[PDB]
Amino acid sequence: VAPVYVGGFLARYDLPRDVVEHWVALPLNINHDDTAVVGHVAAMQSVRDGLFCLGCVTSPRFLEIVRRASEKSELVSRGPVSPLQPDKVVEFLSGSYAGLSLSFKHVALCSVLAVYGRDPEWVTQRFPDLTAADRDGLRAQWQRCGSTAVDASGDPFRSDSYGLLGNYVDALY
Amino acid sequence: VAPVYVGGFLARYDLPRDVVEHWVALPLNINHDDTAVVGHVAAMQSVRDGLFCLGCVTSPRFLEIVRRASEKSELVSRGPVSPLQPDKVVEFLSGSYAGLSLSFKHVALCSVLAVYGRDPEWVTQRFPDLTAADRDGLRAQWQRCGSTAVDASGDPFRSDSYGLLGNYVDALY
């Protein structure tokens, strides 16, 4: 299935730049729920405004659940969508998990900042601050994924629609 | 299936007592979502502290979805539960839809006050204010449900696990 990319800062500097260090892939899960692994971190770049992260949501099971929940919400602009507008799944994710939360152990899409898209370039271009050199640092990293073994043992997602509901309620609670 | 009862104030007086009036059944839905009708209002009593409502969640489909989402959350005290403790479904509902919201058109279990139980008496006894006369006023009303036709045309719920997730995200959004 086609992945969804996500980007955003895991921390602004205004963790210290030197600490985060100014210059193996962490999995991506839902609200720090290990049973809800949906992808992996593709890149991390320390920039002027902070620590920027970019990940890939690859789980076919998680993505299918999102697609179905999206077809049933007022968060998505219904009616056919034109090729010039972000798709339904992208828009729903932007509404359900608007943030990124670091633990590095892993990164969690947080439901309670994060930009979602079908292309890392487009995603990165959604953040004005990031300079070409920044984008280039991010690109060199995620381009490695094309010849990196991920999801080889299969879909990393170990939950279902029922679990995501519980997970959502738990986080909000 | 065994119903779950819910009670709580729809408004405190400290809507005016005279307005609400100091002295056909409204359906119960999730976050004002007509596709998420899960039961009906069984009674409404104007009391000292305000307008108190008591409803019944009867939908077998909604209840089954809740049961499954409950078996997967940190909101529920896992391990076998003893007969002296509120069951898993009751505890999950108390966490996911902690409030009641009036529209009378209908009442919505709101996710973002409401006490859930398997017995209206127990539920009502969870509110100190309510006096015996109050409880008696509430009882005379819900006792009519035993010979009132409800869910006759079937389960009133028109959604699924995917829809509840959308509904939850929508409300929180």
What one-letter code names the amino acid at B73? S
Residues of chain B with C-beta less than 8 angstroms from the C-beta of A96: 169, 173
Task: Give the number of other CB atoms < 10 A from CB of residue A140.
Answer: 11
How far apart are the C-alpha atoms of A116 and A124, rounded to whole Å?
10
Contact B169 A72 (CB under 8 A): no
Q: Which residues contact B38 (CB under 8 A, 6 or more apart)?
A: B28, B29, B30, B57, B58, B59, B62, B63, B109, B156, B157
How far apart are the C-alpha atoms of A166 and B91, rounded to whole Å?
12
Asked if residues A81 and A87 have their Cβ atoms less than 8 Å apart, the reply is: yes
Chain breaks in chain B (C to N over 2.5 A) after: 14, 23, 103, 112
SS3 state at A99: strand
Active-site residue, A40 included:
no
Q: How was this structure determined?
A: X-ray
Closest residue on chain A to B70 (Cα): A166
- Residue-wise over A19-58: b if at least 16 C-beta within 10 A, else e? ebeeeebbbbbbbbbeebbbbbbbbbbbbebbbbbbbbbb
Query: What does DSSP say about strands B4-12 and A27-30: parallel, antiparallel, or unpaired?
Result: unpaired
Q: Which helix (H) or strand (E) holds B27?
A: strand B27-30
> To what resolution in angstroms was this structure determined?
2.3
**Residue with tokens 């999206």, as numbered in its chain:** A70
Query: What does DSSP say about strands B107-110 and A115-117: parallel, antiparallel, or unpaired?
Result: unpaired
Provide the β-strand partners of residue A39: A28, A57
User: Is A154 exposed, middle or buried (CB count within 10 Å of its CB: 0-12, 13-18, 19+)?
Assistant: exposed
Residues of chain B with C-beta less than 8 angstroms from the C-beta of A167: 72-73
How far apart are the C-alpha atoms of A100 and A152, rounded to whole Å?
25
User: Is B106 exposed, middle or buried (CB count within 10 Å of its CB: 0-12, 13-18, 19+)?
Assistant: middle
How far apart are the C-alpha atoms of A65 and B68, rounded to whole Å?
16
Task: Give the number of other CB atoms < 10 A from CB of residue A85.
Answer: 11
Composition of chain B by helix, strand, coil, percent to 5? 35, 25, 40
Phi and psi at A93, nearest 5°, equal -60, -40
Distance from CA of A124 to the nearest CA of B (A): 24
Q: Which residues contact B7 (CB under 8 A, 6 or more apart)?
A: B52, B53, B54, B55, B114, B115, B120, B123, B124, B126, B127
* CB-facing half-sphere around the CA of B29: CA atoms within 13 A: 20
CA-based nearest residue to B96, from B40, B156, B163, B164:
B164
Residues of chain B with C-beta less than 8 angstroms from the C-beta of A162: 65, 68-69, 71-72, 161
How far apart are the C-alpha atoms of B60 and B73, rounded to whole Å?
20
Query: What does DSSP say about strands B33-46 and A107-110: parallel, antiparallel, or unpaired?
Result: unpaired
Return left, alpha or beta for B32; rule: phi > 0 is left, psi -120 to 50 is alpha, else beta.
left
Domains of chain A: 1-173 (3.20.16.10)
Cα B111 to Cα A131, A152, B76, B170, B172, distances in angstroms: 41, 39, 17, 10, 8
CA-based nearest residue to B88, from B100, B72, B104, B103:
B72
Asked if residues B69 and A166 have their Cβ atoms less than 8 Å apart, the reply is: yes
SS3 state at A78: coil
Asked if residues A60 and A51 have their Cβ atoms less than 8 Å apart, the reply is: no
Among B69, B163, B170, beta carbon nearest to A162: B69
Scanning B80-131, the segments in alpha helix (DSSP H) are 88-96, 120-124
